[PDB]
Amino acid sequence: MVLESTMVCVDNSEYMRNGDFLPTRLQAQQDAVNIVCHSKTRSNPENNVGLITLANDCEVLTTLTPDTGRILSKLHTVQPKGKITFCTGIRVAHLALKHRQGKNHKMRIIAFVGSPVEDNEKDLVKLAKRLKKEKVNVDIINFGEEEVNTEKLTAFVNTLNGKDGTGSHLVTVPPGPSLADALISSPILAG
Template identity: 60%
Template sequence: MVMEASMIVVDNSEWMRNGDYTPTRLVAQNEAVNLIFNAKTQSNPENTVGLMTMAGKSPEVLVTLTSDVGKILSALHSIKSNGKSDFLTSVQIAQLALKHRQNRNQRQRVIVFVGSPVETDERTLVRLAKKLKKNNVAIDIINFGEEAENTPKLEAFINNVNNSDNSHLVSIPPGPHILSDMLMSTPIISGEDGAPGGFATGGEGFEFGIDPNLDPELALALRISLEEEKARQEAASKKESSNGEPSKAAGSSDAMAVDSSSSQQQQSQQEDISPEDAELQAALALSMNQSQVEDEDVDMDEMDEDEELQRALEMSMNDNNGEANQEMMSAVLGSLPGVDANDARIQKALEDMKEKKKDDKDDK
């Protein structure tokens, strides 16, 4: 399904109090809004829907683009019939709201419920339609209640905004029918691919033989389960086809990258690996092991030297006479590998120790 951002514009004018649609125009409209929201969001998880009114003091955005049905239902519950509708201004505001969509890959669509007379002249409507078409905004109009009066103007509007049949006008006359039921088979609900309610067809016109509007959670769970099963089957099919191919060079090279220690076994199993590659892999593993052993040997040598130097210093500090034997210390230090007994720093350290012992003896 197409990924869309849709703004639903509802008519909340005084005309919506009429009871020619069960139970009133306003309530019938709210049920249809819920149907459209479910169809849009369930057809593509990345779809978002907003809600705004077109009457009252001025057109007002009630809910910005969202996928949370709770926000839409809460806003619908708060709508009251008041004032006259302003078709022109509300569509312009809806277009502006779509410009602020977060996902720029979403197509733009405005869905307008018109349940009262459209007072804007046809020429102005055509000019707005051309602007929407230029900005790649599709529009769907549900014309009900005053459909006979509004149809000529709205047809001219749709003819000028339509681009590759992406916009639709649906006129529904009054009657004992439910407004939302009449929308089920229209392109507004089926979308561009023609599947009712945004779902693949099956059973009695519904996927899995159930009405997604009566139990949307069950329909969504069944759809997810079906998609997961399809993905699993595709993965299994790809795996079988890859196992049947004569060349396995790519698979064996990936295995060697994961575990270098098993490279020789893989080389024997995969005949198309060259002997040079196997030798390079073994040499790499061997060099890594040798460097680790050399590092351990260096650490042991440094520890031995540190211990010998520590013992020599302790011998000098624990001299029974309190004085360091210079010749003995020089001989001990000279026997240590890499130690120069004549180094100025070592001589200074011995002198300092000698002076300290002398000072301690004088104090006593």
């Protein structure tokens, strides 16, 4: 199977507590963690997946482990109130990826951005060239309400990698009512 370590990032920003995604984004992104942890389980047994809180202070409560049980426990009562912070959210998972015992696993990060961010374009392009030097491939899936047809995030994924690098894909929520399972139905079949 493919060798890599996937680090899932839940969105704890205060804008993620609304029930627009049925029944609530808390359970919606919980099912999103359910489908990414079960797919990586069906993908390779050697994949270890932790969680990271992006907004406010960034702390990983569950050390990187192949078992998602403790991750599912932290999905409940997470108290996702705070202001979204982007620039640190990728690097905090990058440090968790440098603590891996085995060096044969590729560095992989999946994050959810459900809130408008104040991150400047200079900061995301500095992280883009930094990830170019660090080879890390990040697959982001945009939830929630944000700038219509997100650009700085799309340009972030574009300028993140190149040639090929097969790759970083960005999935933005369509402007219409839908279930969270329908939003994650596309990435699970094809990245």
